[PDB]
Amino acid sequence: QVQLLESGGGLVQPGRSLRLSCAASGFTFDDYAMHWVRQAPGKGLEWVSGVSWNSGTIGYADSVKGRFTISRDNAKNSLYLHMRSLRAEDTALYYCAKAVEMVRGLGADPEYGMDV
Amino acid sequence: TKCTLKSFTVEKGIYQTSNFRVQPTESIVRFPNITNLCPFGEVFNATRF
């Protein structure tokens, strides 16, 4: 069974850091690329960050470049998302998502298609 | 036969002289075919690190 355990709840004031943790069950962590997508109320889904199957960070967003950071933990099947020096304008709901494509699906690396 | 008997006069008969033996002419090595491979081409052709 594929269970997503999201940890790091609490209250944070602007000007400080934040840290969220993704845990996955029912599938192998390394085989799929892991992405973060956020969606404030009264607005659609919007990509905020991502990282490939090879634990390669893809970049930082246009609005929050220089402060967000993303990392994987292939040893313990976990994921870290750290928010450096947050501001009150960054308030929204964070979302953790997994890819689908099976490894070596032929002509680039399979890293897309969030489903769960 | 003369130097087998340690003599200069060989008397009528049959004398075992030496040994005949064929030698190996070439070398043959065999193994089952190779099927699997290590995932190095999956790393060096990857899109990113």
Q: Can you give the residue ranges of every domain in chain A?
A: 3-116
* Method by which this entry was solved: cryo-EM
Strand order in the sheet with A3-7: A3-7, A18-25, A78-83, A68-73
Hey, what are A13's tokens?
Answer: 């004031």
User: Is B42 an 8 Å CB contact of chain A?
Assistant: yes
Judged by a CB distance cut-off of 8 A, whether residue B11 touches chain A is no
**Long-range contacts for B32-38 (Cβ within 8 Å, ≥24 apart)?**
none
Q: What is the resolution of this structure in A?
A: 3.4
Sort out which chain A residues have CB atoms less than 8 A from B47's CB and list them. 52, 108-109, 111
The first and second tokens of residue A60, run together, are 């930082």
Rounded Cα gap, residues A37 and A75, in angstroms: 24
Give the bridge partners for A80, in sequence order: A21, A71
CA distance A19 to B40: 35
Q: Which amino acid appears at position A85 of this protein?
A: S
Q: Which residues pair with A39 in a beta bridge?
A: none
Q: How far apart, in whole angstroms, are the C-alpha atoms of residue A109 and residue B48?
A: 9
The residues, ordered by sequence, that sit 6+ positions from A69 with a Cβ below 8 Å of its Cβ are A60, A81, A82, A84
Could you tell me which residues come within 8 angstroms of residue A64 by beta carbon, excluding any fewer than 6 positions away?
A: A48, A90
CATH of domain A3-116: 2.60.40.10
Say yes or no for a CB contact (<8 Å) between A109 and B48: yes
Tell me the three state secondary structure of residue A6.
Answer: strand
